Structures are given as C-alpha cells and as structure tokens.
Design an enzyme around this catalytic site. Structure first.
Site, PDB file in Angstrom:
ATOM      1  N   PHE A 286       0.788  -1.249   0.000  1.00  0.00           N
ATOM      2  CA  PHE A 286       0.000   0.000   0.000  1.00  0.00           C
ATOM      3  C   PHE A 286       0.825   1.309   0.000  1.00  0.00           C
TER       4      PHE A 286
ATOM      5  N   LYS B 173       8.233   9.620   0.878  1.00  0.00           N
ATOM      6  CA  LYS B 173       7.291   8.501   1.021  1.00  0.00           C
ATOM      7  C   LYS B 173       5.854   8.969   0.805  1.00  0.00           C
ATOM      8  CE  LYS B 173       5.709   4.837   4.181  1.00  0.00           C
ATOM      9  NZ  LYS B 173       5.576   4.381   5.591  1.00  0.00           N
TER      10      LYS B 173
ATOM     11  N   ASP C  87       9.935  -3.562  13.273  1.00  0.00           N
ATOM     12  CA  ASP C  87      10.576  -4.079  12.050  1.00  0.00           C
ATOM     13  C   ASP C  87      12.081  -3.798  12.075  1.00  0.00           C
ATOM     14  OD1 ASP C  87      11.014  -5.044   9.338  1.00  0.00           O
ATOM     15  OD2 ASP C  87       8.937  -4.520   8.888  1.00  0.00           O
TER      16      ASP C  87
END
Ligand SMILES: NC(=O)c1cnc2[nH]ccc2c1N[C@@H]1[C@@H]2C[C@@H]3C[C@H]1C[C@@](O)(C3)C2
Ligand SMILES: NC(=O)c1cnc2[nH]ccc2c1N[C@@H]1[C@@H]2C[C@@H]3C[C@H]1C[C@@](O)(C3)C2
Lengths: 285, 277
Positions: free
Chosen positions: B19, B41, B131
């Site tokens: 996405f 981004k 992450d």
C-alpha cells in the site's frame, strides 16, 4: 553474584543523593553475623532517565577490574522481584576527603604521593576502558587501608563513542563546578583530558589535606567573588584569564608544576595519565 | 520546513510496499540541479487505516532526535508525502554484502553500538519499532549507521509497557519474538529479541545462504510455516554462532533471545556490554 533481598540486613546510610542513595548493609545469610559488609546503591522517586543511567553504571562497574577501583560484587532484584539494587564492597576507613582531615598528623608527602599515584593508575585504567569518570574528587575516593585508596561513584561515568575521543552532555552539570574543566563548563564537553583537569584538583585537595579553609570551593569563591552573572559563568571567565588554584602551604614545587600541566587551557596540551604515572612515581625515589 | 510538489524532481524508486512506496527526489527550487536529495514517502490505493497510521508515523518521526535515526525533513501537500533525508550508500544489508573485505569485526561492533543506541533512544520515547532488521538500517557513512522505516512503529500507551496488534504483520517471521509470533505482543523487549537477530545478520555480513530465514528453514513434515518456528523456538533452538563472530557477542545474542521478555537485557544494559569489547 546474586544477592537475596531478605539476607541484606540494613545498618545505616553512607550517602543520600538527589535521585538515589547508598546504604551500608551486611549480607548475612548464615545468621551468625559473620557475613560481609557491603555498600548497596538504589534509586528513589526517580524518572526514566535515571533508571536507564543506573543500568549503565552497573554494567560499567561489573566490567572494571582494577586494584584502584571500588569492586562490583553483584545485584539484588529487591522487594517484590521488581526493583534494582547495586551491591558493592564496603571500605570502612571511609572517604579520602574525611580521612585526610582526621589523620593529617600521621601522613607525610610520601604517603600523599602514594595516593596520587594509585588514583592516577586507576584513572589510566579507566582511560583504557574508554571511560570518563566525570566526578573525580577526594569525596568519591575511598580508603581501602592506610596505604591503599580506590575511586568510587560511577553515577556520572560515561563510555565514549567507539569512533570519537570526546563526549557532549545535553543536560548541563549539577555536581560542584570547581572540579570541572573549562570546555566542560562552557560547552558540557567531557573526556579523559577533562578527567586529567579534575585530577589536578584532587592533587590540590590531597596536598591541602582537604582543609576546608583552602578548599577549591573556598579559594575560587574568594577569586570569583560576589559582584548578577551566574557562579558558573564567572568561574569560567576566571579560568580563561589563566587564574588557577594557588600553591598549597608547604607544597612540593614539582607537584604544583604537575598540577599546572593538568590545568592547561587546551585539552590536547594536558598530559595523559600514562605520562603522569611515571612522573609521580619517581619524583623523589 | 515545508516542501512544494512542483520543486520535487522525481529521480527513481527506493522501495515499494503493498500500500506504500518511497521515491528518491532532488528538492530543486533553483532549477539548476544543486538541490539536496531526499527520500520521499507516500501511499497508493490504500484504505483509511493506512492513511491514519501514516499520520501517526509522520508525527512520531517528526519528534525523534538522534544521530542514529533517519532525519524527518518536512512534508508536501490534497495528498500527503513524508520528506526525509537521503543516505546515498543505501541500506546495511546490501552494504555488508558488497563491502565485506573492507569491513572488519571491530566495525561490526560499531554498527551494533550505534543501532543499540538508536533503540535505546526509541525506548526512552516509549516507542516500539516492530521491524528492526538490517534491511531497515541505513548507512550515513562508512562509520555511521541509522535506523529507518517507522511504518509499523507504535507508541506504547502512557500507563503500560506492552502493545497488542490485533491485525498481525505480514512482514518476515524470523525476526519476531515468541510472544509476537504467538499472541501478537509487541514491546521494547520484543525490539530486543529482533536486535539479537540484527546482530546475527551483521556478524554473518548478511550472507544470503545463511540468512535467518535460510537457517531457520533448515532447522525445519508439513504443518503451517509459522507454527513450526514457534514450536521450535519454544524447544530451545536458536540461530547458530556466526563464523566471523566473537564468543562474547554470541552470548549477548542468546541473552537477547531469552524466552521471557523480563529476562532479556535492556538496550541500556546492552550498550556498555557492546562498547566494552
Ligand atoms: N562502594 C561504596 O560506594 C562505598 C564504600 N565504602 C564507603 N565508606 C564510606 C562511604 C562508602 C561508599 N559509598 C559512599 C557514597 C557514594 C560515593 C562514595 C562514598 C561517599 C559518597 O558521598 C559518594 C556516598
Ligand atoms: N529516508 C529513507 O528511508 C531512505 C533514505 N535513503 C535511502 N537510500 C536507499 C534507500 C533509502 C531510504 N529508504 C528505503 C525504503 C524504506 C526503508 C529504508 C530504505 C530501504 C527500504 O527497503 C526500507 C525501502
């Protein structure tokens, strides 16, 4: 290595900091009272920044192995298995600043130069661990015996970046400004060279026998004077003029000259604890 | 402070997601090509959930100040874009693979030292990365790395030390902790487990054939891919000592991978234990 809370018998207090305290305890599991005395540090009413720095302290001390640095013995995970207590050795003769004032009569320059040298060796080892003590002063030196002293209070101690030799502290200092070097005062910059500056001061303390009437506090405040500029700002101004602490009463000249080198304006011009070591050791012989 | 779209010259793609995507641009208001490069981004065909999270993400990173955390630069506006500094050496995983001859064990400790310090600071901002991996670390210079990708990074509630992700992550299972894998629990201690895996990546110079994925896969009949790993982590199995790894660093990875999060070391404790080797 691991200290059960229930067997640490509290005796009395050695120091009460702003966010922490150090209690004199006896670790006595056997009950017969033969257990060893220990100093136990723990935090009180503290925010997240102190708990984190406290955990750095424990690791730094756990990792320091020298005859001239106070010993890590263990930790205790405390009442309710929740809190954290740092267990260290107890030295019963106490701090150097108090010890010099009491036994002043039975201690001559030779013995003072022995202390200086032990401390210097201790500080050389901390250099080797890329560690800056940041609070080196007679009040944090302990007396193991009449011929052995140790460096203590690693609360403000910090390891250097692996690729740099100096470190900047974001929040400025709170410990007495009279042991702080000029780049520390003006810019919160700390280093082995900064610890070298402060060692000059403990030499002065030593050879004044920590007499209060000519302490760094006492002497600088007489030179700074009251006039409103802050006390931190006028000391710096005093230090940039080239003014220093005066030669103590009856101080061996060559010891006063070593202080002067410890107190050079530019950090790069102060001697390393490696250069100082031999210079102290073979002053008279 | 705020960037204009018409002055953002698109150069090339840096990454892509299901996405979202990151782009390399020069912000070039003079038009003479002397502008600075920036990683920019934005989302693409996403739902409301992604857009909300993306705003959280802009606001967290906006308020992080660490030399080891990629620098928020600004925003550009009808549809929002997050503008960040551009580190031209790229991520650590690809760097370690390319330049292994040039990089010795001491310098892997330095990258470790710097990632831990970044994670310590994220801890003090009560923030969980989720992450942490070499594919999300960036190379500022040969002697300076920085943490990046705050897409999944969540702030802990003010009154609790953990967070529970009801809709679990599609990102790789091998970095996750057993409480994450099992009950989607995320925390600062979860970030410590993954740091352990990051150490493994570093000291294996991100070699493909002995990646965490490859190695965990080699340590496993057929049931679900996930529930084999968790059943294997709860046995006691861990990643091996890398060959180009000192003994004491491997011991720090095993501590990092303790079963109970409470037993795992803080980034505050880890730091000195890295720096004093
Ligand atoms: N291991 C120890 O810390 C320790 C060991 N033996 C001791 N004998 C007397 C005090 C004392 C100790 N701690 C004291 C504590 C921290 C530091 C050094 C001491 C004086 C101070 O003002 C500053 C408060
Ligand atoms: N500001 C930035 O994030 C950024 C800055 N300089 C860069 N140089 C090369 C990629 C890159 C950046 N982004 C990349 C993007 C997100 C994250 C980190 C990078 C690699 C990844 O796979 C994971 C896709």
């Amino acid at each position: 290595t691991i200290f059960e809370e229930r067997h640490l018998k509290y005796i009395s207090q050695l120091g009460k900091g702003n966010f922490g305290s150090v209690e004199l305890c006896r670790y006595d599991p056997l009950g017969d009272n033969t257990g060893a005395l220990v100093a136990v540090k723990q935090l009180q009413h503290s925010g997240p920044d102190q708990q984190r720095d406290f955990q750095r302290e424990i690791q730094i001390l756990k990792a320091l192995h020298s005859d001239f640095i106070v010993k890590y013995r263990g930790v205790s995970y405390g009442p309710g298995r929740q809190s954290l207590r740092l267990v260290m050795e107890y030295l019963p003769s106490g701090c150097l600043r108090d010890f010099l004032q009491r036994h002043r009569a039975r201690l001559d320059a030779s013995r003072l130069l022995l202390y200086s040298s032990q401390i210097c060796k201790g500080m050389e080892y901390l250099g080797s661990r890329r560690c800056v003590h940041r609070d080196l002063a007679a009040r944090n030196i302990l007396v193991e015996s009449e011929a052995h002293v140790k460096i203590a209070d690693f609360g403000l101690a910090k390891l250097l970046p692996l690729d740099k030799d100096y470190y900047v502290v974001r929040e400025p200092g709170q410990s007495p400004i009279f042991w702080y070097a000029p780049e520390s005062l003006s810019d919160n910059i700390f280093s082995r060279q900064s610890d070298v500056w402060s060692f000059g001061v403990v030499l002065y303390e030593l050879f004044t026998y920590c007499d209060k009437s000519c302490s760094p506090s006492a002497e600088f405040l007489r030179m700074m004077g009251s006039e409103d500029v802050p006390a931190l700002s006028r000391l710096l101004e005093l230090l940039e003029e080239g003014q220093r602490l005066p030669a103590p009463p009856a101080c061996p000249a060559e010891v006063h000259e070593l202080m002067k080198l410890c107190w050079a304006p530019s950090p790069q011009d102060r001697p390393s604890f490696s250069a100082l070591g031999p210079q102290l050791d073979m002053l008279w012989s």
